[PDB]
Ligand binder design. Sequence first.
Ligand code: HEM
Ligand SMILES: *[C@@H]1O[C@H](CO)[C@@H](O)[C@H](O)[C@H]1NC(C)=O
Ligand SMILES: *[C@@H]1O[C@H](CO)[C@@H](O)[C@H](O)[C@H]1NC(C)=O
Ligand SMILES: *[C@@H]1O[C@H](CO)[C@@H](O)[C@H](O)[C@H]1NC(C)=O
Ligand SMILES: *[C@@H]1O[C@H](CO)[C@@H](O)[C@H](O)[C@H]1NC(C)=O
Ligand SMILES: CCCCCC
Ligand SMILES: CCCCCC
Ligand SMILES: [Cl-]
Ligand SMILES: [Mg+2]
Length: 325
Amino acid sequence: GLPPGPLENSSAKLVNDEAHPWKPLRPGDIRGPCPGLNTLASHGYLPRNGVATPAQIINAVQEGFNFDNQAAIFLTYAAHLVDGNLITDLLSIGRKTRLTGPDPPPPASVGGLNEHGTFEGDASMTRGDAFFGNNHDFNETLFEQLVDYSNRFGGGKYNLTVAGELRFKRIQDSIATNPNFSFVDFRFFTAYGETTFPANLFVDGRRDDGQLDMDAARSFFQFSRMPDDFFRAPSPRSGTGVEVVVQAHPMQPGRNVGKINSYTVDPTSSDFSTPCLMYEKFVNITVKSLYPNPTVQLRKALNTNLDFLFQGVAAGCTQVFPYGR
Ligand code: HEM
Ligand SMILES: *[C@@H]1O[C@H](CO)[C@@H](O)[C@H](O)[C@H]1NC(C)=O
Ligand SMILES: *[C@@H]1O[C@H](CO)[C@@H](O)[C@H](O)[C@H]1NC(C)=O
Ligand SMILES: *[C@@H]1O[C@H](CO)[C@@H](O)[C@H](O)[C@H]1NC(C)=O
Ligand SMILES: *[C@@H]1O[C@H](CO)[C@@H](O)[C@H](O)[C@H]1NC(C)=O
Ligand SMILES: CCCCCC
Ligand SMILES: CCCCCC
Ligand SMILES: [Cl-]
Ligand SMILES: [Mg+2]
């Protein structure tokens, strides 16, 4: 279906309402590495089993959290292209599931958001690196470090100052402990953006002060649960303030080279100075590597989702066509 348009009415409102009650997981219900999508599924803004169309996801993040249209479109079609079923139009917000329907040929994985190294990546705040055995479950130890960083840099609250320090700490942790640590291209970009989302979107919209309390933080991060009487943000936003997180500890993109403490800058990687290159590499390398020689119906689905992806890309970039026009 078409990418949904922006909200007609973007006002703060109760989103923990009678039609969107929190419910616990039933057997087969899928939750993954994204606390935003997890919460929308656990409140029935998405299907509660955690399998959704891109249009459902875009409508969910806008209606539930006032995620802005451009950011919703970019992230959703990126995730769908590398992790979703392009024929069925279904994406798992977590583990690989037969519920996304018959699989395309390898090397395409359709592994859901749990798929390491497509969208999901290292130095997550409350999820472990894939190397340590679990890239998707809430980690209490990592959350306790989030609380500690909030206590130290945020006076008990998670804010952009806390985001800047924790983002850097998680990178340094992965460099020290994950011999396979990768922090390039798409992950480099999204890892910074993600640290702003709690401050911008998990803060009750009646306050919108960028100060996330730890009761609200645990409710979202661990239980996929909006606070009682949660109001969504009062205006559309996504990553506003990412500049403060970067400026706190500017990092070059790079990877460990098969050993801990071997972080090596990748001059082939995009960085914040080459945003269009991040888009071009995502399409020409990541998507193309998953679908090198697509059949006619997969090629059509790819080109449609790649057009949709480009709608989410900031003006100034040229669209690239790996399967022609
Ligand atoms: C619009 C479509 C969205 C997609 C496709 C998406 C996808 C993802 C994925 C795959 C991750 C895991 C990346 C990683 O840490 O390895 C992630 C992380 C995250 N997402 Fe989402 N997301 C979306 C929207 C949102 C929204 C609306 C929010 C908040 C309201 C949000 C909050 C977060 C946060 C806080 C994390 C970081 C978790 C952590 O590092 O502990 N996302 N997102
Ligand atoms: C927008 O939504 C808010 C919150 O529900 C509501 O109070 C307001 O009346 C709505 N505005 C319009 C123009 O309907
Ligand atoms: C959570 O993260 C900590 C530190 O990274 C790690 O020791 C632990 O194994 C992870 N998983 C669980 C199951 O607590
Ligand atoms: C985070 O909170 C601390 C302590 O209240 C404060 O010094 C800092 O300015 C805050 N940062 C932001 C961006 O609100
Ligand atoms: C992507 O491929 C297009 C079309 O061939 C080309 O113009 C562009 O330079 C490529 N970009 C990258 C980053 O390889
Ligand atoms: C929606 C984010 C756009 C960034 C890519 C240039
Ligand atoms: C959601 C804002 C853009 C993050 C990736 C460039
Ligand atoms: Cl918007
Ligand atoms: Mg991760």
